[PDB]
Design an enzyme around this catalytic site. Structure first.
Site, mmCIF file in Angstrom:
data_model
loop_
_atom_site.group_PDB
_atom_site.id
_atom_site.type_symbol
_atom_site.label_atom_id
_atom_site.label_comp_id
_atom_site.label_asym_id
_atom_site.label_seq_id
_atom_site.Cartn_x
_atom_site.Cartn_y
_atom_site.Cartn_z
ATOM 1 N N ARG A 38 0.190 4.583 2.855
ATOM 2 C CA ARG A 38 0.285 4.273 4.279
ATOM 3 C C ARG A 38 0.704 5.423 5.194
ATOM 4 O O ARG A 38 0.741 5.260 6.417
ATOM 5 C CB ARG A 38 1.183 3.054 4.511
ATOM 6 C CG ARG A 38 0.503 1.706 4.302
ATOM 7 C CD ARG A 38 1.478 0.598 4.598
ATOM 8 N NE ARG A 38 2.405 0.395 3.480
ATOM 9 C CZ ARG A 38 3.577 -0.222 3.580
ATOM 10 N NH1 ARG A 38 3.979 -0.683 4.758
ATOM 11 N NH2 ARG A 38 4.348 -0.368 2.503
ATOM 12 N N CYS B 55 0.824 -1.209 0.000
ATOM 13 C CA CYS B 55 0.000 0.000 0.000
ATOM 14 C C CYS B 55 0.859 1.260 0.000
ATOM 15 O O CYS B 55 1.677 1.461 0.907
ATOM 16 C CB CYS B 55 -0.952 0.015 1.208
ATOM 17 S SG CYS B 55 -1.886 1.564 1.367
ATOM 18 N N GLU C 199 -4.809 4.157 -10.759
ATOM 19 C CA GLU C 199 -5.661 2.987 -10.560
ATOM 20 C C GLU C 199 -6.795 2.952 -11.577
ATOM 21 O O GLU C 199 -7.091 1.906 -12.159
ATOM 22 C CB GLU C 199 -6.255 2.977 -9.148
ATOM 23 C CG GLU C 199 -5.238 2.750 -8.034
ATOM 24 C CD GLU C 199 -5.916 2.688 -6.656
ATOM 25 O OE1 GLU C 199 -6.479 1.616 -6.337
ATOM 26 O OE2 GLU C 199 -5.897 3.701 -5.904
ATOM 27 N N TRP D 39 -8.977 6.521 -0.530
ATOM 28 C CA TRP D 39 -9.293 7.286 -1.740
ATOM 29 C C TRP D 39 -8.308 6.920 -2.841
ATOM 30 O O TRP D 39 -7.211 6.407 -2.560
ATOM 31 C CB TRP D 39 -9.273 8.798 -1.472
ATOM 32 C CG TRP D 39 -7.986 9.282 -0.896
ATOM 33 C CD1 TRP D 39 -6.800 9.479 -1.569
ATOM 34 C CD2 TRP D 39 -7.737 9.628 0.468
ATOM 35 N NE1 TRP D 39 -5.839 9.930 -0.698
ATOM 36 C CE2 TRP D 39 -6.385 10.026 0.559
ATOM 37 C CE3 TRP D 39 -8.529 9.650 1.626
ATOM 38 C CZ2 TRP D 39 -5.808 10.446 1.765
ATOM 39 C CZ3 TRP D 39 -7.957 10.061 2.817
ATOM 40 C CH2 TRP D 39 -6.609 10.457 2.879
HETATM 41 C C1 HEM Z 1 -6.290 6.785 1.898
HETATM 42 C C2 HEM Z 1 -5.652 6.689 0.724
HETATM 43 C C3 HEM Z 1 -5.077 5.363 0.175
HETATM 44 C C4 HEM Z 1 -4.355 5.287 -0.948
HETATM 45 C C5 HEM Z 1 -3.977 6.463 -1.872
HETATM 46 C C6 HEM Z 1 -3.993 3.911 -1.166
HETATM 47 C C7 HEM Z 1 -3.245 3.438 -2.215
HETATM 48 C C8 HEM Z 1 -3.102 2.116 -2.565
HETATM 49 C C9 HEM Z 1 -2.788 1.610 -3.886
HETATM 50 C C10 HEM Z 1 -2.565 2.453 -5.167
HETATM 51 C C11 HEM Z 1 -2.723 0.282 -3.801
HETATM 52 C C12 HEM Z 1 -2.438 -0.659 -4.984
HETATM 53 C C13 HEM Z 1 -3.773 -1.362 -5.188
HETATM 54 C C14 HEM Z 1 -3.879 -1.927 -6.568
HETATM 55 O O1 HEM Z 1 -3.036 -1.543 -7.429
HETATM 56 O O2 HEM Z 1 -4.813 -2.755 -6.770
HETATM 57 C C15 HEM Z 1 -3.008 -0.117 -2.427
HETATM 58 C C16 HEM Z 1 -3.028 -1.395 -1.901
HETATM 59 C C17 HEM Z 1 -3.451 -1.756 -0.629
HETATM 60 N N1 HEM Z 1 -4.016 -0.923 0.349
HETATM 61 FE FE1 HEM Z 1 -3.903 1.163 0.262
HETATM 62 N N2 HEM Z 1 -4.493 3.159 -0.123
HETATM 63 C C18 HEM Z 1 -5.193 4.012 0.725
HETATM 64 C C19 HEM Z 1 -5.872 3.607 1.864
HETATM 65 C C20 HEM Z 1 -5.900 2.340 2.429
HETATM 66 C C21 HEM Z 1 -6.619 1.918 3.638
HETATM 67 C C22 HEM Z 1 -7.546 2.818 4.486
HETATM 68 C C23 HEM Z 1 -6.355 0.610 3.833
HETATM 69 C C24 HEM Z 1 -6.828 -0.341 4.955
HETATM 70 C C25 HEM Z 1 -7.259 0.073 6.156
HETATM 71 C C26 HEM Z 1 -5.450 0.166 2.779
HETATM 72 C C27 HEM Z 1 -4.926 -1.102 2.644
HETATM 73 C C28 HEM Z 1 -4.343 -1.636 1.509
HETATM 74 C C29 HEM Z 1 -3.969 -3.028 1.322
HETATM 75 C C30 HEM Z 1 -4.101 -4.228 2.297
HETATM 76 C C31 HEM Z 1 -3.373 -3.090 -0.085
HETATM 77 C C32 HEM Z 1 -2.827 -4.349 -0.781
HETATM 78 C C33 HEM Z 1 -3.917 -4.665 -1.788
HETATM 79 C C34 HEM Z 1 -3.808 -6.094 -2.170
HETATM 80 O O3 HEM Z 1 -2.880 -6.787 -1.664
HETATM 81 O O4 HEM Z 1 -4.655 -6.517 -2.993
HETATM 82 N N3 HEM Z 1 -5.216 1.238 1.954
HETATM 83 N N4 HEM Z 1 -3.220 1.040 -1.713
HETATM 84 N N1 LIG Z 2 -7.231 -10.817 -10.759
HETATM 85 C C1 LIG Z 2 -6.891 -10.111 -9.907
HETATM 86 C C2 LIG Z 2 -6.529 -9.315 -8.964
HETATM 87 C C3 LIG Z 2 -6.236 -7.987 -9.263
HETATM 88 C C4 LIG Z 2 -5.852 -7.111 -8.258
HETATM 89 C C5 LIG Z 2 -5.755 -7.574 -6.956
HETATM 90 C C6 LIG Z 2 -5.348 -6.604 -5.883
HETATM 91 C C7 LIG Z 2 -6.373 -5.477 -5.854
HETATM 92 N N2 LIG Z 2 -6.165 -4.602 -4.692
HETATM 93 C C8 LIG Z 2 -7.102 -3.482 -4.861
HETATM 94 C C9 LIG Z 2 -6.982 -2.384 -3.821
HETATM 95 C C10 LIG Z 2 -6.824 -2.660 -2.456
HETATM 96 C C11 LIG Z 2 -6.739 -1.607 -1.535
HETATM 97 C C12 LIG Z 2 -6.789 -0.282 -1.984
HETATM 98 C C13 LIG Z 2 -6.711 0.778 -1.077
HETATM 99 C C14 LIG Z 2 -6.768 2.081 -1.567
HETATM 100 C C15 LIG Z 2 -6.878 2.313 -2.940
HETATM 101 N N3 LIG Z 2 -6.922 3.585 -3.420
HETATM 102 N N4 LIG Z 2 -6.964 1.271 -3.801
HETATM 103 C C16 LIG Z 2 -6.916 -0.010 -3.350
HETATM 104 C C17 LIG Z 2 -7.021 -1.060 -4.261
HETATM 105 C C18 LIG Z 2 -6.051 -8.899 -6.644
HETATM 106 C C19 LIG Z 2 -6.437 -9.775 -7.653
#
Ligand code: HEM
Ligand SMILES: N#Cc1ccc(CCNCc2ccc3ccc(N)nc3c2)cc1
Ligand code: HEM
Ligand SMILES: N#Cc1ccc(CCNCc2ccc3ccc(N)nc3c2)cc1
Ligand SMILES: C[C@H](O)[C@H](O)[C@H]1CNc2nc(N)[nH]c(=O)c2N1
Ligand SMILES: C[C@H](O)[C@H](O)[C@H]1CNc2nc(N)[nH]c(=O)c2N1
Ligand SMILES: [Zn+2]
Lengths: 407, 411
Positions: free
Chosen positions: A109, A106, A283, A278
């Site tokens: 963070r 993420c 994305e 947000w």
């Molecule tokens: C507030 C602004 C936030 C931004 C800008 C942000 C940004 C991102 C981005 C760009 C990703 C990549 C996701 C993807 O490409 O599919 C990500 C992943 C992730 N985010 Fe954040 N996030 C935010 C908030 C949060 C919050 C509030 C949580 C949880 C309480 C969180 C937990 C996670 C987790 C666990 C991943 C890994 C996703 C996965 O493994 O599929 N995020 N985040």
């Molecule tokens: N197929 C598939 C496949 C594609 C993406 C993922 C990971 C998607 N993570 C999405 C995700 C998780 C957390 C987020 C938190 C904030 C944010 N702006 N985007 C967020 C986006 C898993 C399986």
């Protein structure tokens, strides 16, 4: 055993000690790195509880206090008696914030400590779940001034009473397979869109249909609910230079709210824990809009720009990609919905890394996920060495509920 | 143990068995991934198994495994090792070794070309002047008036580590960098340290923005010597943009031949510390990294100003916009001047095909995702969506410390 990470653009070196706390495994070995792979009882339960309580009570400067030992004792007795235990509100909140803190993929963070936690452990029904979810959505949306939030449903018991949200995100567009062989709407959600239909949803069969909620309570069968449209904030996408861009008919939703992950705290499992923050612009603009197996709009946009699509070397895809991403940011900003560009976000993350190394001794980070899907090396994270490792509490993936569910 | 990788755009699943032939370490553990870390005198004791492993591979590839010629060669190598503490490779083995080192280079996106490599055997070389001559020939052959040909020139292997051949330049052709009293840098900042050494050794620097560095060549562990590459051998390309006529006035050019000169080639346990090699450029190496890295020529702003972009907010993506045009310009210039180059779309698409072919014919293709994915437009290239497995095979190209940090000066 004490590891260094170098930023090759700035020569700043950070020393990592936090990784020695790490417990779970990476998938990698001495012989093979799997860094780019997408997905690599009572006796079990108490050390997990103990480890968590230890870090909790350390975090509040009462490590080795009577209250610490008392709580350790109390939780210990409860596990022996009930085979599980219940978190104090304080512990739940700390745990959820720290799951986010520990999420190595993420980029956002730096915000980790400002998370609104909604305790929904009193929920017993899918209707109840719906109410809780509408409240989450309205609170987090906040008329476009987004606030990060998580809603936490009751924890797993025997795994035959699981609370699950079947949707991957609270808000997502449907996908329908055509007789034309093509796909209308979001191809990523074709299978789930079918299951909504199989369970009774009347699809409007459009390009951008907001999916219904499929909510599972106490291990029972899932039910459909329509989120009140007034609560679903969406942004029509226009370009600040290209008047024709509005005619592409694109829009997206403001609230990214991931609903299919598993939250683990002190050995306890929360299988239903939708959370939201947000968007980073890429994305939507890069992945959602331009991925081949998604909305895949590059060609059409390129044509409207009248670019030479004869040769790849004209870099027309790259040109279009930029303008599309301009439009997304422009549209969200114009409508006053929170959004962050990939430059601002990665720069924040660098400061966050430095904070974490300084104040915590490190910060687990997955470079493959942190580096944005466009303009990689003009963002600072590209030049930043990162160490990836698994800390708890954590968000984890879990199987899709249909492959699991005993109907 | 079988291992599966998945392309998430095509759902194509591949099975890796080749990783079983891996010995070297990744830097990773079950507890940590060091996948984004840049960088994570041998006894006869450890030398023969390495020889045997290599020769077994070699003779398998030519389908003579277990033959009398296979057996005799092992015997010959064995005796030569225990008699002379080392051994010499046959020309065939050397060529096979060099090609396989490239084939095994997990960070190289251009590996579809691995079997086409002109190997220059410079193992009879004894002096720095001799190295200069070999290198000049390499540059002329490889350049081929713009129709670039992949080549490697291989100098004698390490013996006791006191008589190493080294090319002190990181690339055979590269621009000087000069640190100014005011803190600014003229030329290529990446080359300031090496430039300074050259100057110290007697180089008369023109002190311009694009001065081609002299060669600094070390033979047989002796102190390095300075040589100037004949300018007529150094092919360069003025960078212009197909629509932006002011772009030429930026005064940019680059050299045509990327030729890495500071790596170590390991074959059958033998160490070739001087083995300069060359292919041709992927456009982003120049247009993204060389020009746009903040620590390199760093031209984004000046370019952005000339295009008149909103540079007050980063959310205008003025950086992303200017990056694209610069990369267009680099490609346009090279193609216009008929100098071999490949765009990142073409290159990554080829790599996917190569990789699938390698899985089928070889049982795997070690690949470093962090390096394979281009530094712009990542996910609109197919490699972004490709799971990869990274591991080390020999023969291989290895990093080695910069010679000025280790060299024992003769005087
Ligand atoms: C507030 C602004 C936030 C931004 C800008 C942000 C940004 C991102 C981005 C760009 C990703 C990549 C996701 C993807 O490409 O599919 C990500 C992943 C992730 N985010 Fe954040 N996030 C935010 C908030 C949060 C919050 C509030 C949580 C949880 C309480 C969180 C937990 C996670 C987790 C666990 C991943 C890994 C996703 C996965 O493994 O599929 N995020 N985040
Ligand atoms: N197929 C598939 C496949 C594609 C993406 C993922 C990971 C998607 N993570 C999405 C995700 C998780 C957390 C987020 C938190 C904030 C944010 N702006 N985007 C967020 C986006 C898993 C399986
Ligand atoms: C023929 C055209 C070729 C192209 C387009 C190409 C492309 C590339 C690119 C873009 C990189 C990343 C380098 C960086 O970003 O610094 C790379 C790395 C590498 N290439 Fe290739 N290459 C080619 C030929 C060769 C040849 C002929 C060899 C050796 C015989 C080779 C061996 C390697 C090695 C060992 C690396 C790793 C670099 C490092 O670790 O510093 N390549 N290649
Ligand atoms: N500081 C630093 C630092 C910067 C770059 C590298 C790796 C550079 N690799 C350059 C390289 C190597 C082989 C290549 C082969 C072909 C090609 N077109 N470019 C190629 C480019 C290491 C340390
Ligand atoms: C194969 C590869 O692991 C996969 O495409 C990853 C690469 N990096 C990513 N990074 C982010 N932020 N999101 C993703 O979905 C992916 N996908
Ligand atoms: C820290 C990080 O590993 C470093 O910036 C890497 C990232 N990937 C790269 N990929 C290529 N091709 N070349 C590079 O120099 C780098 N640098
Ligand atoms: Zn790893």
């Amino acid at each position: 055993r004490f590891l260094k990470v170098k930023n090759w653009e700035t020569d700043v070196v950070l020393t990592d000690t936090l990784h020695l706390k790490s417990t779970l495994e990476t998938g990698c070995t001495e012989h093979i790195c799997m860094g780019s792979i997408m997905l690599p009882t009572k006796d079990q339960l108490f050390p997990l509880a103990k480890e968590f309580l230890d870090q909790y009570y350390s975090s509040i400067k009462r490590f080795g206090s009577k209250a610490h030992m008392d709580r350790l004792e109390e939780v210990n007795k409860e596990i022996e008696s009930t085979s599980t235990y219940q978190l104090k509100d304080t512990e739940l909140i700390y745990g959820a914030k720290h799951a986010w803190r520990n999420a190595s993929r993420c980029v956002g963070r730096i915000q980790w400590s400002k998370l609104q936690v909604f305790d929904a452990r009193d929920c017993t029904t899918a209707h109840g779940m719906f109410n809780y979810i509408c409240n989450h959505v309205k609170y987090a949306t906040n008329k476009g001034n987004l606030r990060s939030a998580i809603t936490i449903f009751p924890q797993r018991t025997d795994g035959k009473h699981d609370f699950r949200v079947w949707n991957s995100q609270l808000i997502r567009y449907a996908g329908y397979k055509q007789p034309d062989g093509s796909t209308l709407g979001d191809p990523a959600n074709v299978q789930f869109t079918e299951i909504c239909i199989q369970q009774g949803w009347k699809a409007p069969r459009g390009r951008f249909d907001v999916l219904p909620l499929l909510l599972q309570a106490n291990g029972n069968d899932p039910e459909l609910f329509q989120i009140p449209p007034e609560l679903v904030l969406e942004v029509p996408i226009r370009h600040p230079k290209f008047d024709w861009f509005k005619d592409l008919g694109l829009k997206w939703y403001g609230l990214p709210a991931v609903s299919n992950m598993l939250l683990e705290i002190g050995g306890l499992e929360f299988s239903a824990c939708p959370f939201s923050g947000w968007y980073m612009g890429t994305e939507i603009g890069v992945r959602d809009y331009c991925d081949n197996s998604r909305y895949n709009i590059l060609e059409e946009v390129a044509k409207k720009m009248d670019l030479d699509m004869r040769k790849t070397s004209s870099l027309w895809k790259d040109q279009a990609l930029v303008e599309i991403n301009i439009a997304v940011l422009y549209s969200f900003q114009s409508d006053k919905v929170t959004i962050v560009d990939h430059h601002s976000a990665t720069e924040s993350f660098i400061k966050h890394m430095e904070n974490e190394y300084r104040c915590r001794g490190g910060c687990p980070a997955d470079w493959v996920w942190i580096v944005p899907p466009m303009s990689g090396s003009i963002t600072p994270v590209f030049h930043q060495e990162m160490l990836n490792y698994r800390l708890t509490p954590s968000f984890e993936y879990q199987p899709d509920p249909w492959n699991t569910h005993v109907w």
